[PDB]
Structure 1
Amino acid sequence: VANPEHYIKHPLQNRWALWFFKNDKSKTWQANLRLISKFDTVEDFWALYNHIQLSSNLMPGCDYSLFKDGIEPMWEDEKNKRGGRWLITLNKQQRRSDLDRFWLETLLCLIGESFDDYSDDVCGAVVNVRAKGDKIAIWTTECENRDAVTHIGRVYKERLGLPPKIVIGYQSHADTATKNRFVV
């Protein structure tokens, strides 16, 4: 039989779904959220990533979301309702300098399962392109899991290369939908 190394795609640990949001005042927030496609290999990730717009080129008001297959990118999902997000807030000058590199690094932290035992607490990630300042966030499934949330935040901050002068926060979705629970 042939050596699999020669011809098989490299499976990822999870199957992931990419979503797109375009702000339209004619429609509800949920109706503006649409599924693009799914992938579960390294090769299919790069084929998707290489044919879509960089976040910095999106019209203001748009989002990308990458979530594990089966989890919708909204607070109301069962695996998001009790969770929260590690938030990266960027200034207007950082759309040029950091937004796209931070986003791709965030994508790799997800599909590469970069958070060791706590990668099962990850639900997905969201980049919001906005005129007042863009945002990148990793969503985790239980805001009360102190060890999981902390270790995800610290690993995330280092992978992004942020210096200790910067401090990022973690907010539960219930607070957003109605403060930081943690900071690293």
Structure 2
Amino acid sequence: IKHPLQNRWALWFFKNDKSKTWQANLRLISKFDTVEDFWALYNHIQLSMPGCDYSLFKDGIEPMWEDEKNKRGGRWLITLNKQQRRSDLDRFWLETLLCLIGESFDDYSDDVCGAVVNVRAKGDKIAIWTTECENREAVTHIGRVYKERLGLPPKIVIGYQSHADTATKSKNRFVV
């Protein structure tokens, strides 16, 4: 009676706490693998924050660089301005979630690991994480479709960063 998704997904929370090492602040909330259970979760949280993150990742992949499926990967990063938290954040996040659970990138959705939203005073961020940063055709395909899906204007780019680079930041591998 329920409608299965192609993948099982897990929702993670992150609570900012500078007094603790980063991994200590991560919390696995719940998992789902049907359309019905996705909306049940989404609707519940909408009815029910700064410094914190939400992450939706395929089952078995933790939302961190250290994970085997993220180690060699990277992310398409969308940076919002401060006004867009009110206007665009919720729309962008839901549209991103639907890209994930609806496998919107066709054959290349296999490269998708998950998505993360950072709530930050400096400007909120939404990102789609993929598994191999050197996989140009997959990465660029995901970027092009994702940018279009969120309705972003052509000339202004979004960037793809390697996690290996982000982890050693003291730069983009791709733009779309």
Normalised by the size of structure 1, how large is the TM-score?
0.92
In the TM superposition, what whole-angstrom CA distance separates every residue of 1:59-98 from its partner, at most 9, and x where no partner exists?
Answer: 2100000000000000000000000000000010110111
| Distance in 1, Cα, partners of 2:18 & 2:46 | 23
Cα distance between partner residues in 2 of 1:166 and 1:100: 21
Residue 70 (1) aligns with residue 63 (2):
no
What SS does the aligned partner of 1:65 have? Answer: strand
- Deviation larger for 160-169 or 131-140: 160-169
Residue 25 (structure 1) shift: 2.7
Gaps of 5+ in 2: none
Q: Secondary structure at the match of 1:100?
A: helix
Deviation string 1:31-69 (CA, Å, 9 cap, x unpaired) is: 110011000000000000011148xxx921000000000
SS at match of 2:115: strand
Count of aligned pairs between the two proteins: 174
SS in 1 for 2:46: coil
- 1:27: how far off? 2.1
Which residue matches 1:45? 38
Secondary structure in structure 2 of the residue aligned to 1:60:
coil
| Superposition misfits of 4+ residues, deviation over 3 angstroms | none
Identity percentage over the alignment? 99
> Any idea what the Cα deviations from partners look like across 1:130-165, whole Å, max 9, x if unmatched?
000000000000000000000000000000000113
1:29, distance to aligned residue in structure 2 (A)? 1.1
Hey, what does 1:157 align to over in structure 2? Answer: 147
What is the CA-CA distance between 1:22 and the residue it aligns to?
A: 0.7
SS state of the match for residue 48, structure 1?
A: helix
Aligned-CA RMSD value: 1.2
Provide TM-score, normalisation by structure 2.
0.96
More moved, 45-54 vs 133-142: 45-54
